[PDB]
Design a protein around this ligand. Structure first.
Ligand code: HEM
Ligand SMILES: COc1ccccc1O
Length: 403
């Protein structure tokens, strides 16, 4: 236990969920790599340390304790070596930029229009539930082969998987403080299996262009498929972050633009600025804020801490994206911030595989939104509330517009 960080003993899980930024501002200044008692783990808070751990030859992927309870094995985020290579080879084809460009417009734009058509004449909406999350999950759901799973269900699953994977609080002995907080995740996985098992049954016999059918068949000997147990954890990885994050990215971007009304106006008038707006939104409130981790594979010194082999380090990329070593006034959304590298997609061998896809999903969603509702205003009756330490995003985004 590090004496000058005794105050970390009093940091609570709820505090980190409500707003982790004050604690992490202290961490970035005091201890870029610091053992946080309630999390039971070292956490990397600065860009330099997060990038170093994520790319180091002396680290490899590890799933967090709560992530492991949520996804099991072999979750693509938590494995290495040959299994990771296979799972990356499995997911990467549909995510290849040239492939995404072939169909992303015809995938996402009709979906965005569909959800827009339900409310664009109302003069008010709650964009997280009515637009950002449905576009995000409907787009990926259709890509995966889950066309028949309604957006409400996909959204419920990622919400439950989120809370399960981020159920990280531990007591003084390192045991989960809230062991009952995984049951809901277990329930969501049971539901998912009930839906996806017959789809897999079908895809084994009748492959199609769905991503999950390709996960079963691609690269396999004739007549063989990857075992469903082998791919289910990566399905869960998708049904959490891949479903959740584009929607949170677009919503956080809107919140940031609303916080800079002149920049909102600039982006509406010039939608070519939407990619920049999104990249700044992801830096400003990173959707994957501290969900993943790495484990040292040999003794290594990181930020002056001599870590034994086998030491987990949580990658709080959301804090790294407020590193004042890199950014001026990082808590302020600023479209006109110089484009600098950011860590919202992680780094290294286990960096986000779906960056190009995700950026286009968010781009197209905001393009259609601003075209349909160019006079969007935030419902300033209250502030926007953001929630989450592992994954972070606005819980709601009430807007209005003159009809
Ligand atoms: C704005 C949206 C998204 C953000 C901010 C995001 C961010 C991230 C981050 C931070 C990680 C962990 C990287 C690390 O630990 O170093 C990750 C992993 C991953 N993401 Fe993305 N993600 C997004 C959307 C998506 C989508 C839509 C997909 C799939 C279509 C996807 C697929 C993956 C995969 C497969 C991994 C695991 C990579 C590995 O462990 O090898 N992501 N993502
Ligand atoms: C792409 O989905 C994830 C990424 C990182 C951690 C958990 C996830 O479900």
């Amino acid at each position: 236990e590090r004496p000058d960080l005794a105050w970390l003993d009093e940091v609570t899980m709820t505090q980190l969920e409500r707003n982790p930024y004050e604690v992490y501002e202290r961490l970035r200044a005091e201890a870029p790599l610091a053992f946080v008692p309630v999390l039971g783990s070292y956490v990397a808070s600065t860009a330099e340390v997060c990038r170093e751990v994520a790319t180091s030859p002396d680290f490899e992927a590890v799933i967090t304790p709560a992530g492991g309870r949520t996804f099991g094995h072999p979750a693509i985020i938590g494995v290495n070596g040959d299994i990771h290579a296979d799972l990356r080879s499995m997911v990467e084809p549909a995510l290849q930029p040239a492939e995404v460009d072939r169909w992303i417009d015809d995938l996402v734009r009709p979906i965005a229009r569909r959800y827009l058509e339900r409310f664009e004449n109302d003069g008010h909406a709650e964009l997280v539930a009515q637009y950002c999350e449905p576009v995000s999950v409907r787009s990926l759901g259709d890509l995966l082969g889950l066309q028949e799973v309604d957006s409400d269900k996909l959204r419920e699953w990622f919400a439950k998987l989120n809370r399960s994977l981020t159920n990280a609080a531990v007591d003084e002995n390192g045991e989960f403080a809230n062991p009952e907080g995984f049951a809901e995740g277990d329930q969501a996985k049971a539901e998912i299996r009930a839906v996806v098992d017959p789809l897999i049954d079908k895809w084994i016999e009748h492959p199609d262009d769905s991503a999950i059918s390709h996960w079963l068949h691609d690269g396999m000997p004739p007549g063989q498929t990857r075992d469903r147990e082998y791919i289910y954890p990566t399905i869960y990885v998708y049904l959490l972050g891949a479903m959740q994050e584009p929607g949170h990215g677009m919503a956080s971007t809107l919140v940031g633009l609303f916080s800079r009304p002149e920049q909102l106006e600039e982006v509406v008038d010039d939608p070519t600025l939407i990619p920049r707006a999104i990249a700044e939104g992801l830096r400003w409130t990173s959707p994957i804020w501290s969900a993943t981790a790495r484990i040292s594979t040999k003794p290594v010194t990181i930020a002056g801490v001599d870590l034994p082999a086998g030491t987990p380090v949580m990658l709080s990329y959301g804090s790294a994206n407020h590193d004042t070593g890199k950014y001026e006034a990082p808590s302020q959304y600023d479209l006109h911030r110089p484009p600098l590298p950011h860590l919202a997609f992680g780094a290294g061998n286990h960096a986000c595989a779906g960056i190009y896809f995700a950026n286009h999903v968010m781009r197209i969603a905001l393009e259609e939104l601003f075209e349909a509702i160019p006079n969007l205003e935030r419902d300033t009756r209250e502030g926007v509330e953001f929630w989450g330490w592992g994954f972070r995003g606005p819980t709601s985004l009430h807007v209005t517009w003159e009809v």
